[PDB]
Design a binder for this molecule. Structure first.
Ligand SMILES: COc1cc([C@](O)(CCN(C)C)[C@@H](c2cc3cc(Br)ccc3nc2OC)c2cccc(OC)c2F)cc(OC)n1
Ligand SMILES: COc1cc([C@](O)(CCN(C)C)[C@@H](c2cc3cc(Br)ccc3nc2OC)c2cccc(OC)c2F)cc(OC)n1
Ligand SMILES: COc1cc([C@](O)(CCN(C)C)[C@@H](c2cc3cc(Br)ccc3nc2OC)c2cccc(OC)c2F)cc(OC)n1
Ligand SMILES: COc1cc([C@](O)(CCN(C)C)[C@@H](c2cc3cc(Br)ccc3nc2OC)c2cccc(OC)c2F)cc(OC)n1
Ligand SMILES: COc1cc([C@](O)(CCN(C)C)[C@@H](c2cc3cc(Br)ccc3nc2OC)c2cccc(OC)c2F)cc(OC)n1
Ligand SMILES: COc1cc([C@](O)(CCN(C)C)[C@@H](c2cc3cc(Br)ccc3nc2OC)c2cccc(OC)c2F)cc(OC)n1
Ligand SMILES: COc1cc([C@](O)(CCN(C)C)[C@@H](c2cc3cc(Br)ccc3nc2OC)c2cccc(OC)c2F)cc(OC)n1
Lengths: 81, 119, 37, 50, 220, 81, 81, 81, 81, 81, 81, 81, 81
């Protein structure tokens, strides 16, 4: 009845947030690694290295945020009732 | 097609021709250049050898001393404080000189030894 | 109905077979081919 | 019992491909080694007679 | 359904011994010693060499390069023959599984039983331990326990992969049998092709790891 | 009970997004790590590095979006119910 | 009862599309990361670098599509039944 | 009744603590890997390399903290009940 | 009773194919990465670079195909039933 | 009943410690990789390389220890009961 | 009863075949990635590069096939009943 | 009853076999990637490179087989029963 | 009833040891990669490269041992009972 669906919603939200966290964390890490390497190699290049950076982080953080959004839709507003 | 090899010593054009493959040894390991290849600049090892491989002949082997390597669109270019072909190295003095304590002359000896097929 | 990951007596059978094959090669081949080269 | 049919048929096709790819090239390589060592011993005889 | 690797057996010294897996290792050993006879008889030195001669010579010079790269032949030459058998005795021990017998078949390789690889690996174990004691009677003391499992894992590891790498084949040969015979040949064909590669690679790594463990045993 | 299906859709669908987030998240990082480097190496090449980038991303984001779609199909539709 | 199989297809099927997206998503990344750098090193290589690239992606995308198919086979056929 | 939801509280929440920890632990490990590299390549650059670094880690640690928050919101708040 | 082992076999086949997809995808990705890099380096080595390529890919595909076969054993010819 | 909450808490603590372990292990590995490389490049630099290293490790290790703490708070002092 | 254990065999066993293919497939990538690159640096080194390649593979694939062995011991000859 | 523990061993123990198989199969690759590359650059170094190689593998394999120990202890000699 | 807590403890120990093995194996791999590369680059450094190495591995192995300890603490001396 309700309790099984509630537990399922909790576990689904947990899985969604765990996936989002792994994705965002490692993607931001692997992007900032190239940022730091480019800053260390060509110091004056920083000003431009931020435009390819803040694209990928966007494309990364979107993947995070969307999941977070759906987590709400999974927990507070369980679609299957 | 093939690539163009031009080995110039400090005071004399050692060799120049066309080649199918060019083996040598940079200070960051061995390397083999093929007709097309990204532009590269690299310092050859102390006792480097350079094995050029032509289409219709045998693989020329050159003991190079003090060399640098530059691969471009046209072809390879090797610099060298001293270059000695395979057909001219005296195995006796070359081997005897290898175990010298002087670094430069020992490197010359090891190069002369690699070029003739030994070591 | 039995477990297959259990040691058996075939251990010693194949041990003996392998030992005699080792002796065979050591007396028959290695030293011949080594001296041939 | 047609499992025998499938297994023997597989053996036939794989030995066909073996005769297509593997054995030609490995025979080429072993014959090349034979050629080299025979040339070496022939030059040994030549050095002896010289 | 699919049976697990059971066996027929018989008792000869109170302990039981599997009926099969003795016939197959027997075939392997006799073929090895038979080609050994062939080579010893047809060992050519002056003229063009035969296929089996160049085959064995390439194998033994490979093993020789490896051993003197690890430990000079002057100090421990016996590792070279012990090596090559480990290779060749095992190699055929897998190759014979390519020929079709099944209908359940008793022509599965000798490694399909754990005791085969156990015997080989524990033999290598005691051999390199005797090598270590013969010289005198790791690289960091504080890792004794790893170097303790070094004692135990080498015979374990060497054995287990050699079982697993083979046992999977011993299972897959049955599995493709459950498909219709008029379409089962192609995956059977591919798998039979890969069987040779995996057998050869496994024998090769087993021999090389034997050599390297001997080199590590007789250190100093 | 039938609501277990709902749980199966809530858990299962969750996984479909979790994996997706580890697909885009890292899949763009590993891609952007190249852009941030290429633009650091040859800045005047920034104009052309957006052709291969927007292919890799253009593929990776697909693997995300499709997943999103099916997750919706899992939760708002539940094909097996 | 039968519902316990239904969710067994929704969960398992989800898994088939999780490991799918982690497979393609990262694959197309780690392959495309070698294209960008290549193009970042010599722009005239973009013509020929598509010959290896679209091979790897091909292989990679196969690993995805198969799983995609299987997910349908899990959600729209439920074999074990 | 309620206890099974409690299970979905501790399990799901646990997942949220797990994912984040895999995203942070590796993220900092990769981004930091550039710092340790850059400073080893150019000690003179250390002072500036702490500016891009502390960006990435920040973003990375954000992925942690939010998840941590939601962990409590699963184990202490338990929305669905 | 049958539905329990049915759901177990479905989940097991899902896990098997998820692992197979992750392995094949990322293995072919990391191999094609080196293929694209080596073809960008020495464009004439392409004809040669396929023989170390189609080995690794080959090898990798083994660990995929096996899973596929075993997946069938889990799905169409369930061991215990 | 309480035993089901007990199993939930135990699996949650397991997930927490497993995530912490993966994170700390791979993070320490990737950071010490750069440390060893920088020491093999410039032998004298070791003294300064312990300044960024023990920073990143300090972050990574935190993401472990916290989890450890939380894990105990899960098993010894179950927040839901 | 019996079926539950059977389920635990099909699930658990499946895990052993998942973690296998992830370890092997990626391994034979990271190893092959070093072979291809080698045969792209010195296009005539292939001959010797096989002796360290087929060693590493022999170790890597070990962790896979050993698993498969135990997988049968789980799926066909469950040590517990 | 006892079956619930039996399955608890097959899954739990099964998990142990996947972790190790991912920890070894990748480690033995990431380490081997060094070896091959070394031999591709300085063949003369082969003889010495097997000394730091089989140290790390010596560690890595251990992390596998200790697991392969406990898994056995879980499936043949379940401690709590 | 204890069997549920027993299965919980078993799967908890399985998760702990799997995570610990993944972390330790991949950490030792990524550290030995740097070790072998350093030895293959600056061979005379072979002596000193063991003072940074046996730090990281040390740290890495801590992440294992603790887990190992706690694994037994879940199995043989279960905290919750
Ligand atoms: C629903 O929540 C989203 C979703 C999305 C996307 O699914 C991508 C998600 N990523 C950014 C994490 C997006 C998308 C689908 C693609 C499909 C292919 Br086939 C190829 C490239 C694709 N690229 C995309 O974006 C780069 C998309 C989808 C639909 C409508 C859209 O227009 C309204 C739209 F933008 C973006 C978003 O923005 C906040 N919110
Ligand atoms: C909603 O399902 C899809 C699927 C797909 C693909 O699977 C690509 C998935 N990636 C991008 C993550 C795709 C595909 C399958 C392949 C199969 C092999 Br075997 C080899 C190369 C392959 N390459 C492919 O494209 C790169 C594909 C499949 C079917 C019809 C298609 O035509 C519309 C089609 F494009 C795309 C898509 O976009 C909405 N939706
Ligand atoms: C629907 O399931 C597939 C499977 C496959 C493959 O498994 C490869 C999967 N990758 C590309 C993701 C493939 C295969 C198996 C191998 C087995 C060994 Br042992 C060694 C090399 C192997 N190489 C292979 O191809 C690279 C294969 C298998 C069977 C029949 C086949 O003929 C149609 C066939 F191509 C392809 C496919 O295409 C839609 N669908
Ligand atoms: C709700 O919990 C959060 C979330 C968030 C973010 O989601 C980032 C999460 N990561 C850093 C772990 C954030 C965000 C959303 C994005 C969306 C797209 Br589409 C593209 C780029 C995006 N980038 C973002 O950050 C750079 C965000 C979200 C909402 C409002 C916001 O403004 C008040 C806002 F900043 C931050 C936060 O506090 C630190 N708490
Ligand atoms: C209570 O358990 C902790 C947590 C924490 C942190 O979460 C870091 C977790 N990692 C290092 C393992 C920490 C944190 C949160 C962040 C949030 C954003 Br949005 C952006 C950057 C952030 N950076 C942070 O640290 C660099 C933090 C936590 C709470 C309050 C805080 O004060 C505002 C605070 F700083 C640290 C800790 O002790 C070391 N114990
Ligand atoms: C069955 O439990 C083990 C454990 C172990 C080790 O954990 C190594 C585990 N990996 C290498 C496979 C070992 C160990 C513990 C460490 C603890 C810290 Br804190 C820091 C560094 C550590 N480094 C270690 O070695 C690298 C160890 C463990 C316990 C007591 C010990 O006595 C001193 C001991 F040595 C080996 C083993 O073989 C059966 N069985
Ligand atoms: C009890 O189980 C442990 C735990 C630990 C550590 O958690 C390290 C765990 N890693 C190696 C995987 C350790 C630790 C906690 C940290 C916390 C923050 Br916030 C920031 C940096 C931290 N760094 C740390 O190590 C450098 C630690 C813990 C407690 C007391 C301590 O003494 C003051 C202590 F050192 C070590 C251990 O050894 C037997 N057993």
């Amino acid at each position: 009845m309700d309790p099984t669906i509630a537990a399922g919603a909790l576990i689904g939200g947990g899985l969604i947030m765990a996936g989002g966290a792994i994705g965002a964390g490692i993607g931001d890490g692997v992007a900032g690694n190239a940022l730091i390497s480019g800053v260390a190699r060509q110091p004056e290049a920083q000003g431009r290295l931020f435009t390819p950076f803040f694209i990928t982080v966007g494309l990364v953080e979107a993947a995070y945020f969307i999941n977070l959004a759906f987590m709400a839709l999974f927990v507070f507003a369980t679609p299957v009732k | 097609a093939e690539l163009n090899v031009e080995i110039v010593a400090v005071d004399r054009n050692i060799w120049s021709g066309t080649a199918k493959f060019l083996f040598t040894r940079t200070t960051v390991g061995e390397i083999g250049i093929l007709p097309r290849h990204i532009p590269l600049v690299a310092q050859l090892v102390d006792d480097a050898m350079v094995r050029v491989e032509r289409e219709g002949e045998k693989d020329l082997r050159i003991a190079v001393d003090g060399g640098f390597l530059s691969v471009t669109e046209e072809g390879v270019s090797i610099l060298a404080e001293s270059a000695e072909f395979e057909s001219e190295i005296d195995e006796a003095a070359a081997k005897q000189d290898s175990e010298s304590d002087d670094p430069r002359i020992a490197a010359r000896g090891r190069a002369r030894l690699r070029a003739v097929g030994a070591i | 109905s039995s477990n297959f990951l259990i040691p058996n007596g075939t251990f010693f059978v194949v041990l003996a077979i392998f030992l005699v094959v080792l002796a065979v090669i050591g007396t028959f081949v290695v030293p011949p081919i080594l001296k041939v080269l | 019992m047609s499992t025998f049919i499938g297994q023997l048929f597989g053996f036939a096709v794989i030995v066909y491909l073996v005769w297509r790819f593997i054995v030609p090239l490995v025979g080429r390589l072993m014959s090349a080694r034979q050629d080299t060592v025979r040339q070496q011993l022939a030059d040994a005889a030549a050095a002896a007679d010289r | 359904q699919i049976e697990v690797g059971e066996h027929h057996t018989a008792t000869w010294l109170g302990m039981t011994v599997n009926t099969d897996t003795v016939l197959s290792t027997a075939i392997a050993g006799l073929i090895v010693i038979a080609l050994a006879f062939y080579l010893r008889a047809k060992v050519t030195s002056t003229d063009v060499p035969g296929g089996v001669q160049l085959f064995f010579e390439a194998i033994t010079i490979q093993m020789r390069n490896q051993v003197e790269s690890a430990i000079g032949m002057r100090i421990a030459p016996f590792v070279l023959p012990l090596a090559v058998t480990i290779f060749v005795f095992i190699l055929i021990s897998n190759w014979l599984a390519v020929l079709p017998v099944q209908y359940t078949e008793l022509l599965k390789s000798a490694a399909a039983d754990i005791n085969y690889v156990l015997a080989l690996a524990l033999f290598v174990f005691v051999c390199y331990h005797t090598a270590g004691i013969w010289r005198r009677g790791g690289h960091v003391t504080l890792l004794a326990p790893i170097n303790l499992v070094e004692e135990v894992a080498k015979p374990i590891s060497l054995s287990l992969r050699l079982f697993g790498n083979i046992f999977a084949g011993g299972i897959l040969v049955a599995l493709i049998a459950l498909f219709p015979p008029y379409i089962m040949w192609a995956p059977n064909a591919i798998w039979k092709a890969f069987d040779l590669f995996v057998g050869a690679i496994q024998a090769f790594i087993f021999a090389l790891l034997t050599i390297l463990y001997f080199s590590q045993a007789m250190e100093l």
